[PDB]
Amino acid sequence: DMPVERILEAELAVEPDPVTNICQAADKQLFTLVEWAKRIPHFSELPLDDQVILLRAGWNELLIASFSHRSIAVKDGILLATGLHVHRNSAHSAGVGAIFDRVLTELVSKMRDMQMDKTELGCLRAIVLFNPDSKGLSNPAEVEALREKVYASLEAYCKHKYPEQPGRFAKLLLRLPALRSIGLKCLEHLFFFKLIGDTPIDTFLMEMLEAPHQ
């Protein structure tokens, strides 16, 4: 029903001022995010309004998980989807050093140390996508059901591919609180960049900063 093979395929099919470049890349990746979500089992079957809600609720965490994992072999930096490497010194010199360091310390380095693979990344992102707590969902139980199927498949995968690591499944899930926190902080930064006026923000990224409709 929720084959990790499909999730892995979704990841593989999507594979490609520092702040301005990061925002530029974020807008670009939002289009790709939609294509990725469509490839995730059963997502496109959900009603259109729920698909919108899930993507608007999880895009920032989804994009952060992606560039963090893409940056595993990068030292003290991150690799943007545009091919540009952004080093810690550059982020610090732009005034966003603290949040950049959290990404490196809480996400990139942890993914690197445990050698999180693309299948695991995919499943974690699918879990984030299928967030049953997203407000407005026409049928939260259905999304919750999908989430449960994803983590059931993920745990099965972990136990099979890494039998010598009994805590790997829990380890993967325990990076989600950090991802949630970092995602919220990155969003605050984005809103401030918008507020200041400087830093160009493209249409898709800008649309994500729009208010819902109550």
Binding site: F31, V34, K38, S44, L48, V52, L55, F204, E207, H213
Partner: peptide
Amino acid sequence: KHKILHRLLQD
């Protein structure tokens, strides 16, 4: 509503 996202999901 959210113009761009709807158009992309619809397609």
